[PDB]
Amino acid sequence: ERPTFYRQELNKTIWEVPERYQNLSPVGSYGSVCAAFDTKTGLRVAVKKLSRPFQSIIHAKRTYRELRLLKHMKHENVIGLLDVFTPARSLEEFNDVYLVTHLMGADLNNIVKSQKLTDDHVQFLIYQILRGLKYIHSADIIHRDLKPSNLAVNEDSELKILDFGLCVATRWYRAPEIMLNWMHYNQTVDIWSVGCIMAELLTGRTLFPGTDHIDQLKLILRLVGTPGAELLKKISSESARNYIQSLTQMPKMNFANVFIGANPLAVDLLEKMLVLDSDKRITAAQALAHAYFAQYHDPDDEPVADPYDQSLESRDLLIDEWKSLTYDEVISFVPPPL
Numbered sequence: 001e002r003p004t005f006y007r008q009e010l011n012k013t014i015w016e017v018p019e020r021y022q023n024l025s026p027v028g029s030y031g032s033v034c035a036a037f038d039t040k041t042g043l044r045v046a047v048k049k050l051s052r053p054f055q056s057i058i059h060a061k062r063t064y065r066e067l068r069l070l071k072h073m074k075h076e077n078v079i080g081l082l083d084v085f086t087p088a089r090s091l092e093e094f095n096d097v098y099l100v101t102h103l104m105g106a107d108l109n110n111i112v113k114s115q116k117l118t119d120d121h122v123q124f125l126i127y128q129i130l131r132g133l134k135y136i137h138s139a140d141i142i143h144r145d146l147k148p149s150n151l152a153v154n155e156d157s158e159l160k161i162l163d164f165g166l167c168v169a170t171r172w173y174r175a176p177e178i179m180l181n182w183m184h185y186n187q188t189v190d191i192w193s194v195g196c197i198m199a200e201l202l203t204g205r206t207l208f209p210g211t212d213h214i215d216q217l218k219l220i221l222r223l224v225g226t227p228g229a230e231l232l233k234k235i236s237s238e239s240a241r242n243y244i245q246s247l248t249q250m251p252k253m254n255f256a257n258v259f260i261g262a263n264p265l266a267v268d269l270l271e272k273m274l275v276l277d278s279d280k281r282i283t284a285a286q287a288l289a290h291a292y293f294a295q296y297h298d299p300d301d302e303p304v305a306d307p308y309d310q311s312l313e314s315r316d317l318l319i320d321e322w323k324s325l326t327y328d329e330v331i332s333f334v335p336p337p338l
């Protein structure tokens with residue numbers, strides 16, 4: 001029942017895939033992606049060939065982690081795994097991993113650049129991000145790079161969260177605590193990102209268009225206000241505190257005056273996302289129950305992740321141990337229903 005593989009060279013990369021996958025066409029290059037046609041199903045898929053997956057410890061772990069994660073992501077608003085394969089017949093020759101998903105077209109960036117969004121459109125797009133994030137966050141995973149170009153939006157405005165490689169600067173959507181190199185992060189960093197995206201769908205422009213992380217920080221403080229005493233004290237570096245203290249003391253802007261033409265409920269939600277203290281930001285679960293989404297909110301259809309443990313950053317293993325765990329997951333993979 002092993003499929004028949006065929007070999008092919010594209011952009012100085014060898015691709016060896018099952019014959020069911022035809023018309024491979026490179027769309028991006030750590031892992032490179034081909035648009036392809038699944039002859040079995042008639043569907044357009046993306047095939048990602050991971051770059052040298054077991055050639056560094058960092059790669060081996062990431063490889064295992066992406067596979068184990070995606071094997072368990074089964075949600076309307078999160079990318080799912082259609083297939084996973086390797087040309088290896090044994091663990092001893094296992095050097096390559098390929099992941100297959102539905103092929104995405106436009107991202108959220110294509111939307112906001114192509115049109116001005118009505119409030120209902122903003123509602124549906126943001127609701128779907130939060131529903132997916134609720135699910136991702138429940139598995140104890142942080143996305144860390146939630147931005148419009150990582151958000152696929154199909155022709156009927158169905159949104160999926162994924163990692164789009166480099167197929168819009170990341171720093172525009174980054175919580176301030178990441179750019180301050182805070183060692184430990186809340187999932188709340190992603191909610192900061194949603195606030196930035198939501199603002200941009202309401203106004204049509206990047207909320208905080210920093211040219212670098214210092215500019216980025218200045219722009220942030222201009223809107224939310226410079227931190228108070230207790231926030232300041234959580235910043236352990238005196239030089240960092242001194243630089244922050246040295247900035248002209250910015251008052252907190254009134255979001256209702258800033259976003260003057262927006263739904264007052266969108267503005268209220270915005271205020272709850274873009275709070276400086278990460279402990280005080282609304283959660284995705286809480287956000288979903290916000291009155292802004294009363295049109296789309298259904299507490300019986302906002303599910304959470306299955307019970308598999310996906311908390312792996314803490315885990316230290318040997319390079320060949322990550323490969324063998326990865327091999328087990330490839331072998332035990334069972335393709336989803338239609």
Ligand SMILES: Cc1cccc(-n2nc(C(C)(C)C)cc2NC(=O)Nc2cccc(Nc3ncnc4ccc(N)cc34)c2)c1
Pocket residue numbers: 027028033045046047048062065066069070073078079099100101102103104105136141142143161162163164165166167
């Ligand atoms: C540990 C780890 C490492 C790297 C990525 C992830 N990760 N995390 C996620 C979340 C569930 C947290 C959102 C998703 C990923 N990975 C992911 O999205 N992988 C993936 C797998 C197969 C294909 C693609 N990319 C394309 N797919 C579908 N059409 C395309 C159309 C054009 C292009 N250029 C790319 C594609 C992307 C996790």
Ligand SMILES: CCCCCCCCO[C@@H]1O[C@H](CO)[C@@H](O)[C@H](O)[C@H]1O
Pocket residue numbers: 180214215237239240241243244
């Ligand atoms: C968390 C600690 C934050 C402190 C970072 C302070 C770095 C900002 O100081 C720097 O000022 C330079 C002037 O010489 C400018 O080129 C830049 O705007 C800025 O990066």
Ligand SMILES: CCCCCCCCO[C@@H]1O[C@H](CO)[C@@H](O)[C@H](O)[C@H]1O
Pocket residue numbers: 176177180182184185186217227231234244276277278279
């Ligand atoms: C330039 C000034 C920016 C202020 C940054 C404050 C960010 C506050 O968010 C902080 O996040 C940390 C990481 O999750 C948590 O440990 C802290 O308890 C929380 O207060």
